[PDB]
Amino acid sequence: MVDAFLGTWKLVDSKNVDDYMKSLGVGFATRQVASMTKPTTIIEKNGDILTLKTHSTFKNTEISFKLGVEFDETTADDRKVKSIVTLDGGKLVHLQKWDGQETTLVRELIDGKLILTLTHGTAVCTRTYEKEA
Numbered sequence: 001m002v003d004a005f006l007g008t009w010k011l012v013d014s015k016n017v018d019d020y021m022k023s024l025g026v027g028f029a030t031r032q033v034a035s036m037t038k039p040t041t042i043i044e045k046n047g048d049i050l051t052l053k054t055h056s057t058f059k060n061t062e063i064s065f066k067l068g069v070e071f072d073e074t075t076a077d078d079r080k081v082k083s084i085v086t087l088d089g090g091k092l093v094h095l096q097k098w099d100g101q102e103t104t105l106v107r108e109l110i111d112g113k114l115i116l117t118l119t120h121g122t123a124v125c126t127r128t129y130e131k132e133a
């Protein structure tokens with residue numbers, strides 16, 4: 001059941017994004033611009049295929065996937081990773097693997113807001129998105 005995640009979402013709060021990017025080895029200039037960027041995330045479904053767009057003034061990404069089926073992904077910071085997205089406890093869990101490393105991108109709905117928690121190493125970033133009508 002993925003349906004409550006679907007729609008267009010705008011960033012309205014961010015904690016520790018610099019820590020997370022730094023852990024991934026993102027350079028200072030990219031971190032600088034990213035810390036000021038407020039992306040729009042669009043999640044749409046067509047049958048079993050989900051498409052997740054992230055749009056901003058800095059970088060844009062798009063992925064399509066089926067839940068529970070691995071896919072190749074090239075992230076906004078240019079990592080080539082092996083990914084899988086699944087539902088766990090009602091949360092949308094996106095796991096990326098590369099070079100023996102892992103990061104998780106966990107999305108949960110709390111009071112109608114979409115909370116994205118990104119973990120790599122010890123770094124934990126929490127970003128809050130609100131739904132656009």
Ligand SMILES: CCCCCCCCCCCCCCCC(=O)O
Nearest residue numbers: 034039054056059060061076077127
């Ligand atoms: C597509 C906009 C990405 C802006 C950040 C660019 C540099 C760091 C990328 C780290 C991995 C992706 C982070 C996604 C954060 C989010 O969706 O709010």
